[PDB]
Design a protein around this ligand. Structure first.
Ligand code: PLP
Ligand code: PLP
Ligand code: PLP
Ligand code: PLP
Lengths: 380, 380, 380, 380
C-alpha cells in the first residue's frame, strides 16, 4: 500500500455519517457522561477528534509510535527542547535553521542546559562533541541552503551510545522522501507549514515519536504548555496532506530540471542540489532518502545580478520558506538575515549573492524561461 | 467611551473595503517587496493582521502597553514562565489553577527556577516568602472554587520593592470587571477560552503587558516558541468578544440570583460567591473589581446529593471551565481531580461534595426551577 | 422552557463526543454503506448534519413543522416564489423590501405569474386585490422604514378563504418578538443575515413552514435549485443565534431610549417607531408581537442635516441592513435607492431626508451623546 | 503562460500585505464612505473581494468575458434556466445529468417555458428540434456514464442560427481539458464541487460567460435570487483550484491505465472511455478537448458481480460524483436511481450491472491490484 494511496484514505471511525472530509470539531469543551467520569474527550487542549485524525495519519507516514501536532514548527522544536533538564547537554548541528539557531542560543540556556555546536558532517567533530551528560543530538539534512549531507545512521549510534535522543528535523524532505525513525532517530520534526500543508496558508509543527515512554513525555508538554495545533489548522493540514505525494513528485522534478539548466549556465558559478550527480554527498543522501527535494540554491559571485534575478522574475515570489505549490525565490544571504553585516554573514557559511529557489508545481518551461529572460536583461 | 461600546468598535486601518468584519488572513507567508527589504508582515508566527486587530483591542481593554495572543491560556502562562532564568525564584499562591499547578511543580523546576507556594490571602506569608531572588509573584483572585480574595495592590508593592514582576491571571474576571494593570500588576493573563471568546468553541490565551522592555521580552518568546494564537482562532475571538460585556451582564446577574436561592436553601450548607454580602472578602474584592462574576460553588455535605444535582439538572451541562453562554455544573473534587484519593482529595481546600456552577445567559427562572426540582427528586 | 434558554440548548444526537459546539461537516459527499442503499446523508446539497442542527432549532423557535436554510434571505424569498406556477396570482404589499420589490417586478413575471401590489394596511384593498387566482399573499410588518402595522390575523383568513398561501417576511422581528405561524401565516421568512446571525458576518435566509405537503414542496426546491445555506455558514448562524435573545433585549431597549430622545428633540420633525405610544399601529402591533424591535427612523425636514447626522456620528456606521451588534445609520432615500431622481425618489413613501438607525448593543449614553453633538455641530 | 502556471498565481491587487493566500472577507456588509455614495463593496450578496478573486481566475481559465460563482452546480444551472421567458423553448440533450433532468422536467415548466429533448449526437434530431422560438441549446459531452460525444461547434451554429444561446456543462472535463466558449458555446457551467475544488468538501457552481449583455443578465440573477457562492466556500475553491492541473494530470492517466486493464479483462463485457482508441467518438472528442478525463464505466452483464466489485474493493469509496483526489466507484444503474424499477432503468440508457469509476490520485497499481483481487474473489 503506497504513500500516494495512504494520503487520501479516510479512516474516521468515530463518524456516524462517513463524510468524505473529516468533520471539524471546532469546540473547546465536551460534555462529560457523569459527575464522576470523563468521556474520551473533555478539553481541546488535551485532545480533539480532528487533531487525532491528523496526528494519527502522520504516525503512519513516519512509521512512528505516536505523532503530535503543534501550533507551529518552532513550537514543536521548543517542546523537544523542554525535555533536556538542568545540567544536561545538547549537541546541535551548527548549520541548523534560523529559529532553531535563536532557540539553541538565546532560549535553551536560561534553563541550565548546555549547548554544543558542530558540523554533523564531520563524525570526529560530533564524536568529540558527544559528552557524558549529552541527552540530545539534533540534526538537519540536507542542510540549508548548502544541502550538505550528514550520516543519520552513524550519528544515531554515537548518540545512542551515551543514552541520548536523536532529533531529526525532516521538514525539507517530508515523509515521502525520508523516514529518519528507520535510521536510528528517536524524534523526527516537520514544520508542517511547508510540504505537509503545501499551500502556505497554515502554520503547524509535527513531532513523530519512536518509543512509548518518550511519546508520553511529549504528550505531557503538548498538553501542559498548551501548544496543540488548533482544530481548523488540523483540518487544513488534513486537506493539504492529501496531495503531498502528488505535489512533491512534480516539484522535485521541476527542481531537477532547473538545477540542471542553471548548472550549465554561463553566469552561474555553483549549484547546490543533492540530486545533481556531482553533489558532494549525493550517494550518501540517497542511501537514506528517495529524493533530492525541490529546494536548491546557487551562487553568481554577483550580488547585483542575484537581486535582479530575485526581483525580476515574474513566476517566482520573493518569500521565505519552501514547499508550497508556488515557486519561491530569495537571497538568504542578504535577506533571511537582513541584520547580517559584512562579518555577520561571513560568520555564517553563505555569501551575499546566494539565491535560493523553492520550485513549485508550475510548467517548468515557464519557470526556466522566466529565469533565462532574467539573466538576459541584466545590464552592465 | 464605555466598554460595551468599545467592544464593537471596528478599528481596521489596513482594510481597503471597510468590511464590518475583520478580514481573516489565513496565510502562513507574505510576499516581500524586494530582495533586500521585508514588508509589514512576512510570517504568521511573527505577526498577522487578524491577530494584530485582536491583540490591539485587548491592550485597549486592559490599559496595557501591548497584548499578545497565544494558542491557549496555558501557552500564555508558559511564556510568562520562560521569562524567569536558571536558578531564580517564583512565588505563586497555593490556590492557583490546576494546569498552572502542574506547570509550577513539574515544568518550571526543569529550568533550575525555584518555586515557593503561598496562601496569598495572608500578607505575612507573602512577605515571608518574598526574598532577594524573587523575580515573579503569581496571583489569582477570586480563587477557585472558594472565591478567596487577595489584596492585589499590596502584593504588587511588596514584590516591586523587591524588583519582582507581578502576574495576575484574571481569567475569571475578564476586562470588564477588573483591570489589574491599574493595581500594580505587570502582566495580566486571561484564558480567552473562557469569557472573551464566550462560546466554548475556541482555545486561546492572552497576555496583557505593562512596560516596553517587558513587552519586547514577551514578544520575543511568543515569536521564538511559535505560539501566537492562529488567525481563524483570532477571528473567532474577535467575533465572540463583541458580546462580552452583554454576556457578562446577564451572566453575573444570573449568578447573583442563583446564589441568592441556594444561600437560603435547606439542603445547602455553605455558598461561595463573592457577591454575597456575607462572603469574606466582599469589600476587598469590590475595592478592586467592579463585580463578582458568574462562577460560584456550594457545599451540601452530601457527595451523593451533589452528584445528583450535577447529573439530574436538565439545563446545566456537566463540563469543565466557565464563562460560556451555556450554564455548566460540576464537582471540582470528584471530577476536576477525579483520580483523587481520600487525603489526596482533601489535600486541596475542597470537600469532595463541592459543586461549582457557571451561570450562562438563559432565563434564570428556568435555571432556578431546574435546581429546585433536582433537590426534590433526590432519594433518601 | 424560555427562548433565551432554548437558544443555548445543544441538541446533537448524532455526535459521539458531545462537543459543546456542533461539529461542522465541511464536506460535499458522504460514503454510501453498500452498492444498493444510501446513508442518512449523501450530498450536502441534499442535506448536511450541521445545517440540520440549525434548521431544527429554527423550526422549534418558529413553531413550524420544518424549517429550511438558504444561501441568503433573497434565495429564500426566491424559492417561496418558485412555488407559484405559470399564470397564477401573487398579492404582495407595496411597502415590501427592495430586493423583494425587484424580484416581484422583474423575475416573477418571467414565469407568467401575475403580481398585484397593495397597501396591506387597508383591508379593503387587500380584499379588493384577492381573487380566485391568488395563490400567495406576501406581507411585511412593520414596513420599512415607516414601521406601518398590518393586521396579519385578518389577512390570513381572507387569503385562506381563497385558498392562498400566506408568507410573512419576519426579518425585522425575528423569532423572539413575533411567531407569525401562530397568526395564520403559512411560511415565515427571515433574512438570517440580520438578527439571527447578528454579527454582520454571514449571509443566510430561513424559511419556516407550516404543513407537511408545503414543506415537502419547499424542500423539493431547496434541493433542486441547490440553494441550502452552506455548512460553515450554518455553523456561524448556530454560533451567533445563541446570543439572539440577549442581543435583542439590550438592542430593543436601546432603540426605545434613542427614539425617546429624538421624539422630543427640536430639530426632529417626526419619529417612526412602533414602540412609541403615539405611533399609529402601536396597539395593533403589540397585539401580534411581543416588542417593537430595534430599527426606526426619523425625518428632520433637512436633507442637509440628515446627511450630517449620518456622516458625523462617531458611533454609528454608515451601512445597509440592521440587526447587528453594531449601530448603523443611513438614509434609505438618498442611499438605499441613491440613484433616485426627484419624483422617482418620492415615488416611494419616504422623503429624501429620512434617516434610519439600527441600535446595537453599546452604551446608550454613548450613542445618545454621539447624536447630540452631531445636532450641535451642524452648520447654518 | 501555461494553465499549470496560471492556477497558482496570486493577483490580489487589493491586498496591502500581499499574503500568499487570498484574505477571506467573511462579512455581510461593508461600511459606505458617505451618506450619498457606496464603496466598491456594500453587501456580500452583491459582491465580495474573495469571490471576485475566484470568479476572476475562472474567467481567465475559460477565456470568458466574466465568470460567476454559485452556491452549487444546480444553482448555476437553475439560474441559467431563468433566462428563458414564458413561451420560449429549450432544447435539452436527453442524457443530461440527474439534477439537470429533474430541473428540465419538474421545474422549468411551471414557468411557461417549453422543453424539447434529444440526442445531441444525431445532428438531424437536434436539427429538427431547433424551432423558431428556441432560445437555449443545453449540452453535455462526454455524456455520463456512456461518454457519448456531441459536436459542439456544429450544434453551436445550428442554435446560433435561430439566435439561441448554447450552454455547455463542462463539469466532466474542467477548463484544463476543454474550453467550450472557443467552440461556439455562450455559457459553460462547471459543478465546482468536482474537479475545481477536487477534495469533495465544498459545493459550488460556476457560470463562465461570453458576451457582456449576457453576463449582465447572469449577474442580475446571481445578485437578485441571491445565490452567490459564500466567501468561505470561495476560499476553499481558490485553495483547491491551485492543484487542478496537477490532479487532473495524474487522475486522467490512472483512468487510462485502469480502462486498459479492464478493457482486456475476461469478466468485463464493455468499457466506456473516450480515451480508448476504440471509442465511438474518440477522434471527435479530441478535436475539441485535450483529454478523456478520469471518469469511465463498464459493464459485466452480472449485477451480482458488479455489486461485489463496488462493495468489495478496498481503495474505492462508494459515493456519487467524481473529480476528487479519492477514487470513487458506484452503480449509477441500480443506485444513482434507487427509485428506478425494471422499466424506469430501461427507460434510461444504462443497465442494472453498469459500474462507474472516478479515478483518484493513488498509485494505479494499488487500484488495479485492488480491482483484480475483487474479480478473483467473486464465488459462483
Ligand atoms: C521552515 C523551518 C522551521 C520553522 O517552522 P515554523 O513551522 O514556521 O515555526 C523549522 N525547521 C526547519 C528545518 C525549517 O527549515
Ligand atoms: C481555564 C483556566 C486556565 C487554562 O487556560 P487554557 O485556555 O484552557 O489553556 C488558566 N487559568 C485559569 C485561572 C483557568 O481557570
Ligand atoms: C435585508 C432584507 C432581505 C434580504 O435578505 P438577504 O439576506 O440580504 O438576501 C429580505 N427581507 C427583508 C424584509 C430585509 O430587510
Ligand atoms: C455533478 C454534476 C452537476 C451537479 O452539481 P452540484 O454542484 O452538486 O449541484 C451538474 N452537472 C453535471 C454535468 C454533473 O455531472
Amino acid at each position: 500500500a503506497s504513500v500516494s494511496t495512504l494520503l487520501v484514505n479516510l479512516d474516521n471511525k468515530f463518524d456516524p455519517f462517513d463524510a468524505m472530509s473529516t468533520p471539524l470539531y471546532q469546540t473547546a469543551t465536551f460534555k462529560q457522561p457523569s459527575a464522576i467520569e470523563n468521556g474520551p474527550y473533555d478539553y481541546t487542549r488535551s485532545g480533539n477528534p480532528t487533531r487525532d485524525a491528523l496526528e494519527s495519519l502522520l504516525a503512519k507516514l513516519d512509521k512512528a509510535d505516536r505523532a503530535f501536532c503543534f501550533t507551529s514548527g518552532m513550537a514543536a522544536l521548543s517542546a523537544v527542547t523542554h525535555l533536556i533538564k538542568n545540567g544536561e547537554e545538547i549537541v546541535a548541528g551548527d548549520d541548523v535553521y534560523g529559529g532553531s539557531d535563536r532557540l539553541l542560543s538565546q532560549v535553551v540556556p536560561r534553563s541550565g542546559v548546555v549547548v554544543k555546536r558542530v558540523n554533523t558532517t564531520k563524525l570526529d567533530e560530533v564524536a568529540a562533541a558527544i559528552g557524558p551528560q549529552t541527552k540530545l543530538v539534533w540534526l538537519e539534512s540536507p542542510t540549508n541552503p548548502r544541502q550538505q549531507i550528514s550520516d543519520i545512521r552513524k550519528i544515531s549510534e554515537m548518540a545512542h551510545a551515551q543514552g541520548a535522543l536523536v532529533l531529526v528535523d525532516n521538514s525539507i524532505m517530508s515523509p515521502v522522501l525520508s523516514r529518519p525513525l528507520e535510521l536510528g532517530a528517536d524524534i523526527v520534526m516537520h514544520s508542517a507549514t511547508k510540504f505537509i500543508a503545501g499551500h502556505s496558508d497554515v502554520m503547524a509543527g509535527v513531532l513523530a515519536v519512536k518509543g512509548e515512554k518518550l511519546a508520553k513525555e511529549v504528550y505531557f508538554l503538548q498538553n501542559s504548555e498548551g501548544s496543540g495545533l488548533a482544530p481548523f489548522d488540523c483540518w487544513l493540514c488534513l486537506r493539504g496532506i492529501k496531495t503531498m505525494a502528488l505535489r512533491i513528485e512534480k516539484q522535485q522534478e521541476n527542481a531537477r530540471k532547473i538545477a540542471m539548466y542553471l548548472s550549465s549556465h554561463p553566469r552561474v558559478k555553483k549549484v547546490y542540489y543533492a540530486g545533481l550527480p556531482d553533489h558532494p554527498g549525493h550517494h550518501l543522501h540517497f542511501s537514506q532518502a528517495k529524493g533530492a527535494g525541490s529546494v536548491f540554491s546557487f551562487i553568481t559571485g554577483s550580488v547585483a545580478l542575484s537581486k535582479h534575478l530575485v526581483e525580476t522574475t515574474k513566476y517566482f515570489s520573493i518569500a521565505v520558506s519552501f514547499g508550497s505549490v508556488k515557486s519561491l525565490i530569495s537571497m538568504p544571504c542578504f535577506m533571511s538575515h537582513a541584520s547580517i553585516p559584512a562579518e555577520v554573514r561571513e560568520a555564517r557559511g553563505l555569501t551575499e549573492d546566494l539565491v535560493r529557489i523553492s520550485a513549485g508545481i508550475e510548467d517548468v518551461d515557464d519557470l526556466i524561461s522566466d529565469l533565462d529572460i532574467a539573466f538576459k536583461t541584466f545590464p552592465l
